[PDB]
Tab-separated table of N, CA and C in Angstrom:
chain	number	residue	atom	x	y	z
A	257	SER	N	76.248	108.280	109.669
A	257	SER	CA	76.133	108.148	111.180
A	257	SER	C	76.184	106.663	111.469
A	258	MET	N	75.860	106.272	112.705
A	258	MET	CA	75.888	104.877	113.082
A	258	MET	C	75.129	103.900	112.168
A	259	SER	N	75.877	102.997	111.505
A	259	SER	CA	75.245	102.030	110.604
A	259	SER	C	74.704	102.732	109.251
A	260	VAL	N	75.161	103.912	108.962
A	260	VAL	CA	74.736	104.692	107.749
A	260	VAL	C	75.976	105.300	107.099
A	261	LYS	N	76.450	104.606	106.042
A	261	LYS	CA	77.747	104.976	105.422
A	261	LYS	C	77.603	105.384	104.012
A	262	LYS	N	78.207	106.523	103.606
A	262	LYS	CA	78.456	106.900	102.210
A	262	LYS	C	79.202	105.786	101.492
A	263	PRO	N	79.006	105.622	100.191
A	263	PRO	CA	79.751	104.643	99.388
A	263	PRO	C	81.301	104.732	99.517
A	264	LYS	N	81.981	103.568	99.541
A	264	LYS	CA	83.464	103.511	99.678
A	264	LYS	C	84.274	104.055	98.439
A	265	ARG	N	84.723	105.324	98.458
A	265	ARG	CA	85.851	105.824	97.576
A	265	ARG	C	87.161	104.967	97.661
A	266	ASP	N	87.641	104.446	96.514
A	266	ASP	CA	88.743	103.462	96.510
A	266	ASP	C	90.042	104.239	96.819
A	267	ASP	N	90.625	103.952	97.967
A	267	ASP	CA	91.871	104.633	98.395
A	267	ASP	C	93.098	103.757	98.315
A	268	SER	N	92.992	102.603	97.651
A	268	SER	CA	94.030	101.572	97.791
A	268	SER	C	95.351	101.923	97.032
A	269	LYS	N	95.192	102.805	96.050
A	269	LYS	CA	96.285	103.333	95.251
A	269	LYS	C	96.827	104.668	95.742
A	270	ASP	N	96.232	105.197	96.788
A	270	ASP	CA	96.611	106.586	97.239
A	270	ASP	C	98.113	106.664	97.562
A	271	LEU	N	98.617	105.687	98.286
A	271	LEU	CA	100.067	105.675	98.702
A	271	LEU	C	101.003	105.721	97.504
A	272	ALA	N	100.764	104.864	96.534
A	272	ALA	CA	101.522	104.890	95.284
A	272	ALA	C	101.428	106.131	94.490
A	273	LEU	N	100.233	106.695	94.414
A	273	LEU	CA	100.035	107.888	93.678
A	273	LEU	C	100.711	109.128	94.419
A	274	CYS	N	100.583	109.198	95.730
A	274	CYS	CA	101.259	110.318	96.457
A	274	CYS	C	102.808	110.197	96.257
A	275	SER	N	103.303	108.936	96.267
A	275	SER	CA	104.760	108.688	96.078
A	275	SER	C	105.173	109.169	94.691
A	276	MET	N	104.356	108.916	93.659
A	276	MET	CA	104.606	109.425	92.287
A	276	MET	C	104.635	110.917	92.184
A	277	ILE	N	103.645	111.561	92.779
A	277	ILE	CA	103.607	113.013	92.815
A	277	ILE	C	104.891	113.559	93.503
A	278	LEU	N	105.254	112.990	94.627
A	278	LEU	CA	106.344	113.482	95.419
A	278	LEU	C	107.637	113.325	94.594
A	279	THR	N	107.755	112.206	93.848
A	279	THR	CA	108.913	112.013	92.926
A	279	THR	C	109.002	113.123	91.877
A	280	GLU	N	107.891	113.484	91.280
A	280	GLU	CA	107.795	114.549	90.324
A	280	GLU	C	108.253	115.875	90.970
A	281	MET	N	107.808	116.105	92.196
A	281	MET	CA	108.203	117.354	92.917
A	281	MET	C	109.707	117.303	93.217
A	282	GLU	N	110.202	116.159	93.669
A	282	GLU	CA	111.633	116.030	93.978
A	282	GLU	C	112.572	116.271	92.779
A	283	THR	N	112.116	115.936	91.584
A	283	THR	CA	112.920	116.044	90.385
A	283	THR	C	112.700	117.328	89.586
A	284	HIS	N	111.830	118.221	90.018
A	284	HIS	CA	111.585	119.470	89.375
A	284	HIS	C	112.853	120.353	89.547
A	285	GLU	N	113.223	121.118	88.532
A	285	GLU	CA	114.446	121.924	88.682
A	285	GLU	C	114.377	122.965	89.772
A	286	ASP	N	113.178	123.442	90.110
A	286	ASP	CA	112.959	124.442	91.116
A	286	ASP	C	112.750	123.845	92.552
A	287	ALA	N	112.972	122.577	92.699
A	287	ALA	CA	112.813	121.932	94.010
A	287	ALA	C	113.922	122.261	94.987
A	288	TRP	N	115.095	122.711	94.492
A	288	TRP	CA	116.266	122.869	95.366
A	288	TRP	C	116.103	123.584	96.694
A	289	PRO	N	115.220	124.593	96.834
A	289	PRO	CA	115.082	125.144	98.186
A	289	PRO	C	114.418	124.260	99.203
A	290	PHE	N	113.795	123.147	98.728
A	290	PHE	CA	112.798	122.375	99.491
A	290	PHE	C	113.222	120.939	99.730
A	291	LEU	N	114.364	120.533	99.208
A	291	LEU	CA	114.788	119.141	99.225
A	291	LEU	C	115.172	118.648	100.600
A	292	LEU	N	115.714	119.527	101.412
A	292	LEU	CA	116.196	119.211	102.770
A	292	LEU	C	115.689	120.214	103.756
A	293	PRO	N	115.691	119.869	105.058
A	293	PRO	CA	115.295	120.809	106.068
A	293	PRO	C	116.222	122.024	106.141
A	294	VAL	N	115.603	123.155	106.338
A	294	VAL	CA	116.354	124.417	106.500
A	294	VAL	C	117.255	124.209	107.723
A	295	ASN	N	118.522	124.629	107.607
A	295	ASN	CA	119.478	124.435	108.682
A	295	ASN	C	119.258	125.525	109.751
A	296	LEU	N	118.673	125.100	110.842
A	296	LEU	CA	118.205	126.054	111.895
A	296	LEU	C	119.354	126.693	112.653
A	297	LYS	N	120.546	126.107	112.545
A	297	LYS	CA	121.763	126.693	113.136
A	297	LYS	C	122.310	127.778	112.246
A	298	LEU	N	122.111	127.672	110.937
A	298	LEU	CA	122.723	128.596	110.018
A	298	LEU	C	121.828	129.652	109.467
A	299	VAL	N	120.489	129.609	109.680
A	299	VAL	CA	119.647	130.575	109.022
A	299	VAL	C	118.957	131.341	110.105
A	300	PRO	N	119.412	132.596	110.316
A	300	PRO	CA	118.790	133.450	111.348
A	300	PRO	C	117.326	133.632	111.119
A	301	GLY	N	116.578	133.635	112.193
A	301	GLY	CA	115.142	133.899	112.143
A	301	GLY	C	114.291	132.638	111.990
A	302	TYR	N	114.856	131.611	111.336
A	302	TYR	CA	113.969	130.497	110.849
A	302	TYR	C	113.297	129.753	111.921
A	303	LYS	N	114.103	129.431	112.938
A	303	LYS	CA	113.620	128.654	114.057
A	303	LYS	C	112.485	129.320	114.818
A	304	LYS	N	112.627	130.625	115.106
A	304	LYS	CA	111.588	131.342	115.845
A	304	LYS	C	110.340	131.684	115.049
A	305	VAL	N	110.523	131.990	113.771
A	305	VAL	CA	109.474	132.407	112.944
A	305	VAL	C	108.608	131.273	112.396
A	306	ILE	N	109.248	130.174	112.014
A	306	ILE	CA	108.511	129.082	111.249
A	306	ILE	C	108.243	127.960	112.237
A	307	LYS	N	107.004	127.940	112.688
A	307	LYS	CA	106.643	127.113	113.832
A	307	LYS	C	106.623	125.623	113.474
A	308	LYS	N	106.325	125.340	112.197
A	308	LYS	CA	106.299	123.946	111.724
A	308	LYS	C	107.104	123.780	110.437
A	309	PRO	N	108.424	123.608	110.551
A	309	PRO	CA	109.276	123.403	109.350
A	309	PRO	C	108.862	122.148	108.622
A	310	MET	N	108.938	122.172	107.299
A	310	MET	CA	108.636	120.987	106.526
A	310	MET	C	109.462	121.073	105.212
A	311	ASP	N	109.828	119.933	104.676
A	311	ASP	CA	110.642	119.818	103.466
A	311	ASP	C	110.315	118.473	102.772
A	312	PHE	N	110.728	118.331	101.535
A	312	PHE	CA	110.422	117.124	100.768
A	312	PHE	C	111.023	115.861	101.331
A	313	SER	N	112.265	115.946	101.841
A	313	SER	CA	112.885	114.736	102.470
A	313	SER	C	112.140	114.231	103.672
A	314	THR	N	111.600	115.118	104.472
A	314	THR	CA	110.812	114.808	105.646
A	314	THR	C	109.457	114.209	105.243
A	315	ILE	N	108.869	114.775	104.194
A	315	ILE	CA	107.601	114.196	103.698
A	315	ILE	C	107.861	112.820	103.156
A	316	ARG	N	109.008	112.612	102.457
A	316	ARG	CA	109.301	111.306	101.832
A	316	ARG	C	109.499	110.269	102.973
A	317	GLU	N	110.190	110.638	104.008
A	317	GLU	CA	110.405	109.679	105.126
A	317	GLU	C	109.052	109.365	105.816
A	318	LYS	N	108.218	110.380	106.079
A	318	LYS	CA	106.886	110.168	106.647
A	318	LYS	C	106.055	109.232	105.765
A	319	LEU	N	106.055	109.485	104.459
A	319	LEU	CA	105.338	108.677	103.500
A	319	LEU	C	105.787	107.195	103.518
A	320	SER	N	107.079	106.994	103.577
A	320	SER	CA	107.682	105.677	103.535
A	320	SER	C	107.510	104.928	104.855
A	321	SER	N	107.137	105.522	105.945
A	321	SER	CA	107.075	104.868	107.255
A	321	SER	C	105.650	104.882	107.846
A	322	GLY	N	104.633	105.049	106.956
A	322	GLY	CA	103.244	105.067	107.457
A	322	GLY	C	102.804	106.099	108.374
A	323	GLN	N	103.379	107.325	108.213
A	323	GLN	CA	103.011	108.401	109.109
A	323	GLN	C	101.947	109.414	108.559
A	324	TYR	N	101.512	109.130	107.338
A	324	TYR	CA	100.272	109.811	106.779
A	324	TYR	C	99.034	108.888	106.886
A	325	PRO	N	98.037	109.309	107.686
A	325	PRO	CA	96.867	108.423	107.754
A	325	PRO	C	96.034	108.448	106.510
A	326	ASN	N	96.088	109.537	105.747
A	326	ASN	CA	95.283	109.611	104.521
A	326	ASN	C	95.881	110.652	103.558
A	327	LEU	N	95.375	110.692	102.327
A	327	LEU	CA	95.995	111.581	101.307
A	327	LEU	C	95.815	113.086	101.726
A	328	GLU	N	94.809	113.478	102.544
A	328	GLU	CA	94.696	114.868	102.956
A	328	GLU	C	95.820	115.349	103.909
A	329	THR	N	96.315	114.449	104.765
A	329	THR	CA	97.361	114.861	105.674
A	329	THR	C	98.659	115.004	104.849
A	330	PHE	N	98.808	114.234	103.785
A	330	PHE	CA	99.993	114.348	102.866
A	330	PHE	C	99.937	115.725	102.199
A	331	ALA	N	98.743	116.075	101.672
A	331	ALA	CA	98.616	117.407	100.955
A	331	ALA	C	98.872	118.557	101.945
A	332	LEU	N	98.460	118.392	103.224
A	332	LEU	CA	98.677	119.442	104.205
A	332	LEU	C	100.188	119.727	104.398
A	333	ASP	N	100.981	118.679	104.489
A	333	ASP	CA	102.455	118.833	104.637
A	333	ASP	C	103.110	119.448	103.381
A	334	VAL	N	102.650	119.034	102.176
A	334	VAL	CA	103.207	119.607	100.965
A	334	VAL	C	102.914	121.141	100.973
A	335	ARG	N	101.647	121.497	101.256
A	335	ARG	CA	101.226	122.925	101.223
A	335	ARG	C	101.992	123.700	102.315
A	336	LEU	N	102.237	123.067	103.476
A	336	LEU	CA	103.052	123.661	104.532
A	336	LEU	C	104.444	124.089	104.033
A	337	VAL	N	105.077	123.272	103.176
A	337	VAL	CA	106.354	123.634	102.586
A	337	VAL	C	106.221	125.053	101.886
A	338	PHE	N	105.170	125.232	101.087
A	338	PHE	CA	105.041	126.426	100.308
A	338	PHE	C	104.527	127.616	101.084
A	339	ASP	N	103.730	127.347	102.073
A	339	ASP	CA	103.289	128.360	103.046
A	339	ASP	C	104.400	128.879	103.891
A	340	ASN	N	105.270	127.994	104.340
A	340	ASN	CA	106.499	128.416	105.023
A	340	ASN	C	107.424	129.245	104.147
A	341	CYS	N	107.579	128.830	102.892
A	341	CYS	CA	108.383	129.557	101.919
A	341	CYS	C	107.870	130.993	101.763
A	342	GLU	N	106.548	131.138	101.623
A	342	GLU	CA	105.947	132.526	101.446
A	342	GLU	C	106.081	133.359	102.709
A	343	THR	N	106.034	132.728	103.873
A	343	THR	CA	106.221	133.440	105.157
A	343	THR	C	107.606	134.083	105.311
A	344	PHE	N	108.621	133.403	104.831
A	344	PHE	CA	109.987	133.747	105.041
A	344	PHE	C	110.701	134.441	103.886
A	345	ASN	N	110.165	134.322	102.675
A	345	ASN	CA	110.877	134.752	101.499
A	345	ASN	C	110.037	135.759	100.689
A	346	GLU	N	110.724	136.788	100.203
A	346	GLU	CA	110.039	137.727	99.328
A	346	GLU	C	109.590	136.993	98.047
A	347	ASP	N	108.384	137.358	97.571
A	347	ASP	CA	107.900	136.898	96.224
A	347	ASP	C	108.906	137.123	95.062
A	348	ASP	N	109.584	138.263	95.029
A	348	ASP	CA	110.583	138.604	94.003
A	348	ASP	C	112.006	138.256	94.513
A	349	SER	N	112.193	136.975	94.809
A	349	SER	CA	113.497	136.363	95.147
A	349	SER	C	113.465	135.060	94.369
A	350	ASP	N	114.631	134.493	94.130
A	350	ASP	CA	114.699	133.205	93.488
A	350	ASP	C	113.912	132.112	94.290
A	351	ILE	N	114.097	132.095	95.592
A	351	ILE	CA	113.410	131.086	96.435
A	351	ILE	C	111.901	131.336	96.457
A	352	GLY	N	111.483	132.614	96.522
A	352	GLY	CA	110.072	132.978	96.601
A	352	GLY	C	109.393	132.568	95.301
A	353	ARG	N	110.024	132.817	94.164
A	353	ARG	CA	109.477	132.399	92.860
A	353	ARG	C	109.405	130.868	92.740
A	354	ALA	N	110.467	130.205	93.208
A	354	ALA	CA	110.537	128.730	93.202
A	354	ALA	C	109.319	128.203	93.925
A	355	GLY	N	109.000	128.742	95.095
A	355	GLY	CA	107.900	128.247	95.871
A	355	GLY	C	106.525	128.448	95.243
A	356	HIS	N	106.299	129.622	94.624
A	356	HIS	CA	105.084	129.755	93.810
A	356	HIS	C	104.974	128.794	92.678
A	357	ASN	N	106.065	128.561	91.916
A	357	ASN	CA	106.080	127.642	90.805
A	357	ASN	C	105.766	126.193	91.248
A	358	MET	N	106.417	125.802	92.347
A	358	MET	CA	106.211	124.457	92.870
A	358	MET	C	104.788	124.216	93.428
A	359	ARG	N	104.237	125.198	94.057
A	359	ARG	CA	102.855	125.116	94.540
A	359	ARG	C	101.889	124.894	93.357
A	360	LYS	N	102.058	125.762	92.323
A	360	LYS	CA	101.276	125.571	91.102
A	360	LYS	C	101.422	124.209	90.511
A	361	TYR	N	102.665	123.694	90.349
A	361	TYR	CA	102.939	122.410	89.868
A	361	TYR	C	102.252	121.296	90.654
A	362	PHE	N	102.349	121.399	91.984
A	362	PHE	CA	101.731	120.404	92.837
A	362	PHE	C	100.208	120.375	92.697
A	363	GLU	N	99.601	121.558	92.704
A	363	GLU	CA	98.156	121.639	92.817
A	363	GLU	C	97.509	121.088	91.520
A	364	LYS	N	98.175	121.311	90.386
A	364	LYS	CA	97.755	120.667	89.135
A	364	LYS	C	97.846	119.135	89.160
A	365	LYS	N	98.994	118.597	89.587
A	365	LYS	CA	99.124	117.134	89.730
A	365	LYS	C	98.077	116.581	90.692
A	366	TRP	N	97.774	117.321	91.743
A	366	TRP	CA	96.849	116.880	92.788
A	366	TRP	C	95.390	116.768	92.198
A	367	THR	N	94.968	117.818	91.529
A	367	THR	CA	93.688	117.861	90.817
A	367	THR	C	93.606	116.811	89.740
A	368	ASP	N	94.618	116.725	88.872
A	368	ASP	CA	94.571	115.730	87.825
A	368	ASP	C	94.577	114.298	88.325
A	369	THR	N	95.254	114.025	89.444
A	369	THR	CA	95.336	112.665	89.925
A	369	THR	C	94.076	112.207	90.712
A	370	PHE	N	93.498	113.075	91.520
A	370	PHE	CA	92.487	112.696	92.518
A	370	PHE	C	91.080	113.346	92.322
A	371	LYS	N	90.942	114.371	91.473
A	371	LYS	CA	89.713	115.215	91.437
A	371	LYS	C	89.129	115.359	90.011
């Protein structure tokens, strides 16, 4: 509260570490559904159904231009990618499996790096 602060957790490396994680996600073989924004002109249903589209290129641009205030807002956008994937794609599809695999991959890197 006012004039009463918990000890300072060192966040000075967070930007570099999120950039490393994102590089790992970008280079994963199963990243292909997530590398670019879904083309809203070409994919029926997407625009109306998925209220907040998100993809790795968009996260990378946000990351590079100071649009994440902290590492939690970065994790929220990454998880949004996989939540959107599960909303739109059957689990037993190539894209649906890709999204489960990538979520697992991310959440391990996230725990190992920060927790």
